Amino acid sequence: KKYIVALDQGTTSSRAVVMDHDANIISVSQREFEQIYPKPGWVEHDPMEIWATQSSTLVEVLAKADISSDQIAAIGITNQRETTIVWEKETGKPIYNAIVWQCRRTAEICEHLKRDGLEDYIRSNTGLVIDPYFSGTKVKWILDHVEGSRERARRGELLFGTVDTWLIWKMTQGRVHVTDYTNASRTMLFNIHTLDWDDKMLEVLDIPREMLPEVRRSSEVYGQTNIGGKGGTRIPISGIAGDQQAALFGQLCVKEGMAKNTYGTGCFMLMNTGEKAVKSENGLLTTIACGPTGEVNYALEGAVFMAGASIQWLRDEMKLINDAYDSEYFATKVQNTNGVYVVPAFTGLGAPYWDPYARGAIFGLTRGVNANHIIRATLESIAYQTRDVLEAMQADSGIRLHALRVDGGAVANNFLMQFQSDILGTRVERPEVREVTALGAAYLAGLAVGFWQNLDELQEKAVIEREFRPGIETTERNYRYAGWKKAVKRAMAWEEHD
Amino acid sequence: KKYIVALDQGTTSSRAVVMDHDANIISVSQREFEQIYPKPGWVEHDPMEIWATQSSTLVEVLAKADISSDQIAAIGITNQRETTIVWEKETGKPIYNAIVWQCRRTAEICEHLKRDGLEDYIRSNTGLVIDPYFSGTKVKWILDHVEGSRERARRGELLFGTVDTWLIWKMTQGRVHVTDYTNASRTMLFNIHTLDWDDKMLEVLDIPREMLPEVRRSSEVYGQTNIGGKGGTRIPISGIAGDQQAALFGQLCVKEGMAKNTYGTGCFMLMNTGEKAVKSENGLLTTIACGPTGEVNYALEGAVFMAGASIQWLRDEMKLINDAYDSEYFATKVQNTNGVYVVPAFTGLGAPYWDPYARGAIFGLTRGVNANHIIRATLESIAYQTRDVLEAMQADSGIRLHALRVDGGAVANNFLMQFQSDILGTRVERPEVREVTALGAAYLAGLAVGFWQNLDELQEKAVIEREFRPGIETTERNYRYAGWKKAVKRAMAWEEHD
Amino acid sequence: EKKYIVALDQGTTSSRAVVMDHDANIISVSQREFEQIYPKPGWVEHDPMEIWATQSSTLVEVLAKADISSDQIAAIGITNQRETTIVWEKETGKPIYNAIVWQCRRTAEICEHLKRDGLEDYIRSNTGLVIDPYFSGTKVKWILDHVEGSRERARRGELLFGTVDTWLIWKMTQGRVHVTDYTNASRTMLFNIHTLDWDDKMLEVLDIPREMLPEVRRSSEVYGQTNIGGKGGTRIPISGIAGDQQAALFGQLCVKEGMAKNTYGTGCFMLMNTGEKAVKSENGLLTTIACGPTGEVNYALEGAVFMAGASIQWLRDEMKLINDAYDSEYFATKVQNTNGVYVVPAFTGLGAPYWDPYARGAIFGLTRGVNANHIIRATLESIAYQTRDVLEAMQADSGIRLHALRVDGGAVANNFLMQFQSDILGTRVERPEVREVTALGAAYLAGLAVGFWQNLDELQEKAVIEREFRPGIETTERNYRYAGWKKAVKRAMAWEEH
Amino acid sequence: EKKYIVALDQGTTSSRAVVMDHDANIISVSQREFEQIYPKPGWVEHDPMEIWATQSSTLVEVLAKADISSDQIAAIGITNQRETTIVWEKETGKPIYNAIVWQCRRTAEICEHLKRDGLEDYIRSNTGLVIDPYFSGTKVKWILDHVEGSRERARRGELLFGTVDTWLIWKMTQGRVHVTDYTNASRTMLFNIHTLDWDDKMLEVLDIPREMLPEVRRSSEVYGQTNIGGKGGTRIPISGIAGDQQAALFGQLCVKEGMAKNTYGTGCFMLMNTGEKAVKSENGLLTTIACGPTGEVNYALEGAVFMAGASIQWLRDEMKLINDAYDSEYFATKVQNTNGVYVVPAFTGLGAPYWDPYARGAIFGLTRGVNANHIIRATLESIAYQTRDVLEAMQADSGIRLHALRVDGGAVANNFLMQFQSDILGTRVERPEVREVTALGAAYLAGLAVGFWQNLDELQEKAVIEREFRPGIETTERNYRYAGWKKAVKRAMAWEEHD
Ligand SMILES: Nc1ncnc2c1ncn2[C@@H]1O[C@H](COP(=O)(O)OP(=O)(O)O)[C@@H](O)[C@H]1O
Ligand SMILES: Nc1ncnc2c1ncn2[C@@H]1O[C@H](COP(=O)(O)OP(=O)(O)O)[C@@H](O)[C@H]1O
């Protein structure tokens, strides 16, 4: 009994990870899963595939690392936060695929609410923005979209759930219908002061309460699981959080003012705002983090929809790189983007913009622009975007951050990193372990299980493997930025409202 | 006595065709040359390299076809229209590279003029539009960049010329310094009415009249060349015309209201308006063509900067494809652009927009979008463009095309062909022989020296290879076209000038 | 309850997991490729943890993905890559050396003495085996000698040995179980095929402590149970074991004497069923245990080809000449002959009927016009060649003239291959509807065991000849191309220095 | 006045034209590759016209682009690929058949008849050539026998026979002149190297009308003029011709006995000057004619290897393994060695010291973990091997172990290869700054005639070794690797089936 196990249900892959008591990484599992675009603007995931992969990674992580059911103190869980599931309570079968948080299909529905004038209400109790991004719209969607859903829904025959929930249920044979604070926040269904489903929003979206599941603390005993092994082995489930929050947490951004920015399929920037929830005026998200004890807290969140994904697109779709990591190479074979700009609004915009109608776009093409500029453009867009939110933050925040605690798959790229310090004019912290989403999940659980007795017990745990100071002139910084800002403006509003 | 040679010094390649009296392409020779992009929006060529390749070709088609210097009746010359070259007479060495019609460096220069109510005149006098495209401002520009050029030139130390102009001089060792009408009407410098150098123009731009060459007829001995051989052999240069203008003539559009479309590096639609010059109101150019005799005729013209070039760009720069023939195969792997649009303003706008500041851009980008979608979007810009002008054409022309006739490299592409057909809803006629440009120069030089008594002998000559009636995909046309429009507006105004 | 049977295929390049219904319908498949280690030219290894880890996650995964729950599995079938040797520590359960693969050749040295020593007839007689590094014996000894004080702990109980099945079953029973079937045991070169038990002459020759040995068992029989979680007290019976080859002969219903099949996976295996008589080869073929219609020990004539689908992987992965294995046929068909080039896929020694551990891969007949495609096709070709090779011996040894070859394996997707083979043999060819005959074989057995099925014939109406390739062209070529091939071989033979 | 000499390099794969000056620098170059045609597996053909046309445009382009007038050219030097045989109609000036590339193997059969009729000794002694389908003889005859009434017209004075120097010049004199040189003429196996003239037995044995051969001349000397137009009445002396190998040797100032060079191109050639002395060789080398310090007649030991640069071109154009020959280096350095792989590149048979028309190209040591890097790498090494093969025959035959190796050719750029090479022989490898040496010879051969330069000394210090490669591999290793090759080689032999 001396291992903790984090579960990370990524946007593109399912991960499984293994730490010890000194919190190292004994092992990793990963599997990607099919991403579906039934139609341009839309994103879906197979719930079944989401599962399997997530299960198998679990099982495969121990196997290979040669660990037995028995030594697993507990299991923590983080997931991508907005994607929505709905299935028959009985058969445990989805009434429709999972709609990822990217999928813009409920834009239209958003229009309605915007118009009924719920904007202030929503910013107010949920702290969210009216976006197809959030779960509510989605649920109403399956709901309206499937024959007598609403009905079954009422007869409590159907279960609504995010990923964490779905995970756990499956996990516990349908025994446990739960989810933690953090994940509830982004549903735009649950009140954040109150701390429990906004009664108003259910009516609004026309959503039968029967369907929701209990909400709990992010750090706590929720259940157990039997994955086989040596007769009588049950594994506990003591930790749940959205990756974002997980990272935040595994980053030890446990006081107000503390923040990090993560780089994976998207970009997330979160600042801990302690016990008090700052209402943003600069196009940010107010949300729930975790205190040093898995306690409710608040946070300022800036969400970027596309980051490493552009890069995935380069390779899967554009097929211009053979592997992610190549980007560094190619992008550095030139001195600039040669006037080029990418606006990766592939799935709309996001903070601080919030533009369901924007699409992805390339700018300032000329004859002599080759592929290397493009790729490089792609990277930098990442860098701009952040700049977009960071400011917003300092705006809303009132704090002027002095360095950037980043993390994610992509922090591995040094270019992007340098580029980022430059463009920012800020220091950039690069911790020695980049799977913190996973840590935050280990941390939360084992906490819940006295695997660790408190945070501090970790503290000297977090190590900056490298830091980046800028190097470029203010003039050009702003100079390049302006370009970016203009590029943005050309993109927004592309798609037509039906 | 047996053959005539056409010479096509095209934007991207130098060429040499051998026709017989029967009007048959007996042998061919292509050579490609370097495209220089000193910087974004600028495109130069090496004048020597132009020379270089163009001589090699001629020398090459001949050998190959086992043809002796004596057997050639005349030499015709066609060329890329607007590139300016400038050299010393005493040495025949350029003070600068050829500056391309593409090249957008003289934009500032155009704003001065615009600023000086110079417009009405220019249009009036030259039938052109203020824009970086003309050798006008170009010339000037070199003059201002090279130390004490002006003075030398005044003292007639420096020669000025277009391409034909440079070729002929080169080929007649300095002996002859001349130009034809068509060409000359593309300088901004020359009066299409008058039939001679506009002084205001020469004044306004401050170009020394010494540098200009003799404007001549499109069909007329001008001199001769010595390419060795038996000995005593001298070959005459009987024909000259701007390629756009040569193509039109080779299409035998010698009567008023007869049109053609040309797709090579760029796109150029022309209409023979007979002895009367029609003034554009729709963004079109008024220019000089040839009569059925090689005599001054007038044409309305639409000009698109980027046509075949894009495929080359995907090719050389993007490397998405291996060959331009390819493109088709990729485009037909998908059934729509996935809503992605491309605007090939790599080198500014042009007809009917004229916007030296537009730069290329790709729009409606999304995650399921791949290379093919892209390649295909690329070909579509092509038809979109042609549709654009084709309409100014009919506004201006008042004539409704009951069918397009076309030519150039690109027309071998049936995707392009058929698309174009459905996009326009008009029929598209494709010849068996597509180098109708060379033909036109064959035709002129030939007509000149008695090789053929008239166009008559050449009428029975053509043959349509394919006629592209518009695929049912002629219902959804404004719809497609409409995205197009939207898209363009978004391309417009990229580069910074203020 | 219990509607499903699960086959486990632990192949040389991947591990699978297959779910059948009572109708013997693959309700789900799972794969995951795994590393191929070549510490040195001529040697192949695997990681027993990786073999494990893969095999694990697959099972878990097919289940998952198909929504089948543990309570529903009547039993589990088990198949494996046959010769590969593993040696762990009973306590820790950890290995003291990587799986050494049948392919591997480090043992020829040892093998060298055994020849030296006179051990032919015996080995062959009692084993029906030949002296070669293909078989586990030599391998074992090897590790024993390489690992320090192996023999001690070996005799002190301490170390276990196992083939794959051994290794997987040991692992799914927590160590509780240490079984093996006949089929499998035969391939060790350690155990007596007549006697039905470990041959101690051997054990003595090779100096292998019987402590470390496991128990030979019945191919169809409950050996034990596994626990993979679920509704407490859930466990699954392990009723089936076979070497995939034999495993395959069975799935294919070749349970009567004179019945054979050919299998095209990573390699090539032809086996004929000899009823209860163990026919002694005299043409380079092996004699091995097989399965009667009840799991009963039968006997077989077997031809073992080391490089078959392996070659194609080489091309794609190593030569990188291909993207997908399915590509191969396309390219090959791109040429029309191989331009007289031959490929000899002896990357891993010779194998029947030659057995030549000193031969290495080689390519012949190259010329300046020989290109990739020709080469590819040569590769494919080499497969139908090695086949015709053994097929002859089969009918030497068998004395039976097979009228049509029945086939199976992953590579039979190849129409080209299938056709070429047809022609090369000048015999018809039967492609089944399903190709996972191997996993099938395994389900059958373990299901027969647990009464899933009461008899084969139940399953007879299963098997649908999806396609039949009849011999194409005339003899002449046949023999002609063959001679070509023979030549080649002889020059492959004897490369390595020993 | 006349401030420049121009060299025409006509190679097996591309047509060149170089422009130098009095200070023998290179003002410019123009190349162009031309189609390799393989009618049948082991058959090598070229469109005479393409050879022509390419040489033309190249000549033209150098001038044109360098801004150089016919009036400025002191003369044209000429070199070519050596065995490729062209035969055309005197009237029309048209090839009766493609040009048969030296590489071509189609005449083995015929070489058989030869050996069989006891001629090995003679051929070896008057011509200095070994019986193979390498040389011109059989080619001609082949043609001859294959074209209906050729022989007839060929006596009837209507048909012409030429190597490539010869087809060029005549194409550039409008048929005025039909000449050839010592160097080239010696590779036909129809020319006696002492007598220094057309072999009768030769013509006899082979049935070739004396009436078709150009006339044999010096290497440096004025043979004609050409007119390429320009400023009226401009003529250009054609003042030099040599087989490019001999050209290289020459352009290396390889001019006294003991002096030798290795050239690495589409093939690989190694030759060493034996002065005036014609050494018959026992070790498989070639005996031929080279140039004296004045263009006078010299002699040499040649070592001819069929594929060097061509092997890579096969990776690049056929196997598509690399996209650029220069890449080679890159790839092969991603590996420490070659996983026991060996590439024997007998695409075109053997060649010295082997001499095996039946030999095919092959690959050995194949194993599962062998990737394309190893193949490329092996490819490279084969070059090094073969060199070491001829190299030895040479020391055998001449008693001298080369202290340093003077090299050149297009492939000498490959640093890897260079080094490997050093390693494999355990000899120093001198790399000149200008590797374009074949041309240079030609220029030298020309300007010299035309008195452009009066002596070679004028030319001496003009040479500079850009790089020296010393062997960095332990003897054992060195030899060890050799033995392997040697083994591989044999397996390669006699693959082909001779009825
Ligand atoms: N099959 C093809 N499909 C599409 N575009 C093509 C195709 N072939 C050539 N192109 C383009 O057409 C142009 C060559 O046409 P051409 O008319 O010969 O040149 P130019 O206008 O300068 O004289 C290049 O831009 C080339 O990519
Ligand atoms: N870096 C390199 N490595 C290997 N071969 C090279 C390299 N660079 C050029 N080459 C090769 O050298 C040959 C060119 O020979 P060169 O001396 O130019 O041509 P030629 O055949 O006419 O003598 C080509 O076959 C090319 O494949």
Contact between A198 and A191 under an 8 Å Cβ cutoff? The reply is yes
Q: Which among C56, C174, C231 has the least Cβ separation from residue A63?
A: C56
Contact between B365 and A368 using a beta-carbon 8 Å cutoff: no
Contact between A4 and A442 under an 8 Å Cβ cutoff? The reply is yes
Alpha helix locations (H) across C93-163? 108-116, 120-122, 136-146, 150-155
Best probe residue, ligand 2, of D8, D12, D13 (max atoms within 8 Å of C-beta): D13
CA distance C215 to C178: 7
Q: What is the spatial order of strands in the sheet that D465-469 belongs to? A: D286-288, D300-305, D268-273, D260-264, D404-408, D428-432, D465-469
Is the fold of A1-251 the same as that of A252-492? yes
Identify residue D326 by its one-letter amino acid code: Y
Contact between C229 and A231 using a beta-carbon 8 Å cutoff: no
Q: Which among A48, A49, A226 has the least Cβ separation from residue C232?
A: A226
Q: B318 at the D interface (CB within 8 A)?
A: no
Residue D328 CB–ligand 2 contact under 6 Å:
yes
- Please, which residues bridge with residue C299 across strands? C289
Q: Rounded to the nearest 10 degrees, what angle do helices C327-334 and C372-397 cross at?
A: 100
Q: How is domain C1-252 classified at the CATH fold level?
A: Nucleotidyltransferase; domain 5 (3.30.420)
Picking from A255, A288, A58, the residue whose alpha carbon sits closest to that of residue A187 is A288
Q: Whose CA is nearest to atom 15 of ligand 2?
A: D265
SS3 B380: helix
CA distance A368 to A377: 15
Sequence-ordered list of residues with C-beta below 8 angstroms from that of C154, at least 6 positions apart, any chain: C144, C208, C209, C211, C212
Contact between C367 and D311 under an 8 Å Cβ cutoff? The reply is no
Residue of chain B whose Cα is closest to the Cα of D51? B64
**For chain A, how far is it from start to end, CA to CA, in angstroms?**
57
The token duo for A242 is 């959205």
CATH code that applies to domain A1-251 = 3.30.420.40
| Count of Cβ atoms closer than 10 Å to residue D91 Cβ | 11
The token duo for C158 is 């301490």
b/e B104-141 (16+ beta carbons within 10 angstroms → b): bbbbebbeebeeeebeebbbebbbbbbbbbbbbbbbbb
The token duo for D225 is 């003029």
CA distance D482 to D485: 5
Is residue D484 packed enough to be buried (19+ CB in 10 Å), middle (13-18) or exposed (0-12)? buried
Checking chain C for breaks where C and the next N are over 2.5 Å apart, the residues before them are none
Binding-site sequence positions of D for Zn(2+):
477
Picking from D9, D176, D31, D199, the residue whose alpha carbon sits closest to that of residue D93 is D176
| Count of Cβ atoms closer than 10 Å to residue D172 Cβ | 25
Greatest extent of chain A over all pairs of C-alpha atoms, in Å: 68
Pick B1-242's CATH classification: 3.30.530.20, 3.40.50.720, 3.40.50.10800, 3.30.420.40.
3.30.420.40
* Ranges of each domain in chain D: 3-243, 244-497
b/e A154-176 (16+ beta carbons within 10 angstroms → b): eeebbbbbbbbbbbbbbbbeeeb
If you measure from the C-alpha of residue C277 to the centroid of ligand 2, how many angstroms do you get, rounded to a whole number?
65
Residue position matching structure tokens 């070859």: C405
If you measure from the C-alpha of residue B311 to the centroid of ligand 1, how many angstroms do you get, rounded to a whole number?
8
Asked if B touches A (at least 3 Cβ pairs < 8 angstroms), the answer reads yes
**What distances in angstroms separate CA C262 from CA A119, C378, C416, one per listed residue?**
70, 20, 16
Nominal resolution in Å? 2.6
Contact between D107 and D115 under an 8 Å Cβ cutoff? The reply is no
CA distance B278 to C180: 95
Residue C101 is given by DSSP the state P
Q: Which CATH superfamily is domain B243-498 in?
A: ATPase, nucleotide binding domain (3.30.420.40)
b/e B381-413 (16+ beta carbons within 10 angstroms → b): bbbbbbbbbbbbbeebbeeebeebbbbbbbbeb
Pick the ligand that lies closest to the CA of residue D437.
Answer: 2
Contact between D444 and D77 under an 8 Å Cβ cutoff? The reply is yes
Contact between D64 and B52 using a beta-carbon 8 Å cutoff: yes
Residue D402 is given by DSSP the state -
Chains that touch D (3 or more CB pairs under 8 A): B, C
CA distance A437 to C129: 55
Q: Does the annotation flag C477 for ligand binding?
A: yes
- Please, which residues bridge with residue B408 across strands? B263
User: What are residue C156's phi and psi, to 5 degrees?
Assistant: -80, 15
Q: Give the atom of ligand 2 at the shortest distance from the alpha carbon of D326.
A: 1
CA atoms within 13 A on the CB side of D433: 9
CA distance A217 to B110: 68
Contact between C346 and D366 under an 8 Å Cβ cutoff? The reply is yes
b/e D385-413 (16+ beta carbons within 10 angstroms → b): bbbbbbbbbbeebbeeebeebbbbbbbbe
Contact between D229 and B230 using a beta-carbon 8 Å cutoff: no
Identify residue C346 by its one-letter amino acid code: A
Alpha helix locations (H) across B205-354? 243-250, 308-312, 326-331
CA distance B286 to B278: 7
- Please, which residues bridge with residue D85 across strands? D100
Identify residue D484 by its one-letter amino acid code: G
Q: Which helix (H) or strand (E) holds B485?
A: helix B477-491
CA atoms within 13 A on the CB side of B72: 37
Residue D325 CB–ligand 2 contact under 6 Å:
yes
CA distance D101 to D143: 13
Alpha helix locations (H) across D136-240? 136-146, 150-155, 164-173, 182-185, 200-206
Binding-site sequence positions of D for ADP:
12, 16, 266, 309, 410, 414
The token duo for A408 is 């994610």
**What is the per-residue DSSP string for C58-75?**
HHHHHHHHHT--GGGEEE
Q: Which CATH superfamily is domain D244-497 in?
A: ATPase, nucleotide binding domain (3.30.420.40)
Binding-site sequence positions of B for Zn(2+):
476
Three-class HEC string of C340-354: CCEEECCECECECCC
If you measure from the C-alpha of residue D339 to the centroid of ligand 1, how many angstroms do you get, rounded to a whole number?
47
Q: Does the annotation flag C284 for ligand binding?
A: no
Identify residue C397 by its one-letter amino acid code: D
**What distances in angstroms separate CA C62 from CA A36, B196, C5, C33, C224, one per listed residue?**
21, 84, 12, 15, 21
Q: Pairing mode, if any, of strands A259-263 and A403-407?
A: parallel
Contact between C313 and C325 under an 8 Å Cβ cutoff? The reply is yes
Binding-site sequence positions of B:
11-13, 15, 81-82, 133, 232, 234, 243-244, 265, 308, 312, 409, 413, 476
Is cis: bond before C353, omega within 30 of 0? yes
Contact between A225 and A172 under an 8 Å Cβ cutoff? The reply is yes
Beta strand extents in C265-341 (DSSP E only) = 268-273, 286-291, 297-305
Experimental method: X-ray
CB pairs under 8 A between A and B: 103
Pick D3-243's CATH classification: 3.30.420.40, 3.40.50.720, 3.10.20.30, 3.40.630.10.
3.30.420.40
Q: Which among B35, B363, B367 has the least Cβ separation from residue A37?
A: B367
CATH code that applies to domain C253-498 = 3.30.420.40
User: What are residue A287's phi and psi, to 5 degrees?
Assistant: -150, -170
User: What are residue D124's phi and psi, to 5 degrees?
Assistant: -70, -35
Residue D14 CB–ligand 2 contact under 6 Å:
yes
Best probe residue, ligand 1, of B32, B102, B263, B420 (max atoms within 8 Å of C-beta): B263
Residue of chain C whose Cα is closest to the Cα of A93? C67
The Cα of A119 is separated from the nearest Cα of chain C by a number of Å equal to: 41
Q: D106 at the C interface (CB within 8 A)?
A: no
Q: C25 at the A interface (CB within 8 A)?
A: no
Alpha helix locations (H) across B367-435? 371-397, 414-424
CA distance D379 to D399: 30
SS3 B171: helix
Residue C277 is given by DSSP the state -
**What distances in angstroms separate CA D272 from CA A16, A75, B326, D12, one per listed residue?**
70, 79, 51, 22
**What is the per-residue DSSP string for A227-259?**
--SSSS--EEEEEEEEHHHHHHHHTT--STT-E
CA distance A439 to A69: 20
Angle (CA) C168 C173 C176, round 5°: 115
**What distances in angstroms separate CA C179 from CA A473, C228, C238, one per listed residue?**
72, 20, 11
Sequence-ordered list of residues with C-beta below 8 angstroms from that of C179, at least 6 positions apart, any chain: C165, C166, C169, C214, C215, C217, C223, C224, C241
The distance from CA D133 to its chain's CA centroid, rounded to whole angstroms, is 15
Residues in chain C: 498
**What distances in angstroms separate CA C334 from CA A17, B50, C250, C331, C373, one per listed residue?**
47, 40, 37, 5, 7
Pick the ligand that lies closest to the CA of residue B308.
Answer: 1
From chain C, the residues in CB contact with D103 under 8 A are 368
Q: Rounded to the nearest 10 degrees, what angle do helices C415-425 and C477-492 cross at?
A: 100
If you measure from the C-alpha of residue B362 to the centroid of ligand 2, how many angstroms do you get, rounded to a whole number?
42
Sequence-ordered list of residues with C-beta below 8 angstroms from that of D176, at least 6 positions apart, any chain: D170, D224
- Assign domain A252-492 to a CATH class: alpha beta
**What distances in angstroms separate CA A261 from CA A78, A407, A429, A478, C489, one per listed residue?**
16, 6, 10, 21, 62
The distance from CA A186 to its chain's CA centroid, rounded to whole angstroms, is 11
Residue B28 CB–ligand 1 contact under 6 Å:
no
CA distance A47 to A55: 12
The distance from CA C59 to its chain's CA centroid, rounded to whole angstroms, is 20
Q: Whose CA is nearest to atom 24 of ligand 1?
A: B308
Beta strand extents in C189-229 (DSSP E only) = 191-192, 197-198, 215-217, 220-226
Picking from D161, D9, D12, the residue whose alpha carbon sits closest to that of residue D90 is D161
User: What are residue A433's phi and psi, to 5 degrees?
Assistant: -135, 120
From chain B, the residues in CB contact with D231 under 8 A are 173, 226
Sequence-ordered list of residues with C-beta below 8 angstroms from that of B82, at least 6 positions apart, any chain: B100, B101, B133, B134, B135, B138, B162, B186, B187
Chains that touch A (3 or more CB pairs under 8 A): B, C
CA atoms within 13 A on the CB side of D50: 16
